[PDB]
Amino acid sequence: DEPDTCGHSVNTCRASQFQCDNGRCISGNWVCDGDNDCGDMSDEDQRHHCELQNCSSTQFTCVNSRPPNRRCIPQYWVCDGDADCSDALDELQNCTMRTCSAGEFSCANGRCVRQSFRCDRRNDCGDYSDERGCSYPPCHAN
């Protein structure tokens, strides 16, 4: 199929579909979805497609975000038990729940997280309250 049924380099992918790697050409919508389709995965980049996204029904968009994080999540994750968006806007919404105890670290915005998620490499609470004021001990030898 790939080793010898065709000329390797005699001619390109046909103009019916769009080139994206020398080993792969891509049909249409697939260049914009975030899937590893082009086989170097560079579909949603360069300059051709998807600087932005938009959400359908039963989905919500993390507006305050950049391409490195996320820009659309389903309702299956809004006001759930775990933050999803870049700034964790999904858990605030109109919910704004009360209950939080000494068993979890308390953020400025009101949300709470486990104590282990304080002073680390991750933006856990969205507000970055879990990171502000921390004093990181130095790294290991390795």
Binding site: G28, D33, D37, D82
Partner: protein, 72 residues
């Protein structure tokens, strides 16, 4: 790490759930086998060769029961 945008999202969020490793590993094996199923769905969808759309229901219900089965 995984091909479809949604499977990577499920994989980070499954790690955010701190699920047991044996349950978490079984998630990928069900999603990675679905990865090969969704590729042939997506080929026959954009090419329109799936005239009856048989490959969509069997991936949608599988994903739904995956979400219910593994505690998501």
């Amino acid at each position: 790490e995984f091909r479809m945008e949604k499977l990577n999202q499920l994989w980070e969020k499954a790690k955010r759930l701190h699920l047991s490793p044996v349950r978490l590993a079984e998630l990928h094996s069900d999603l990675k086998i679905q990865e090969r199923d969704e590729l042939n769905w997506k080929k026959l969808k954009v090419e329109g060769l799936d005239g009856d759309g048989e490959k969509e229901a069997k991936l949608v219900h599988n994903l739904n029961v995956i979400l219910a089965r593994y505690g998501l």
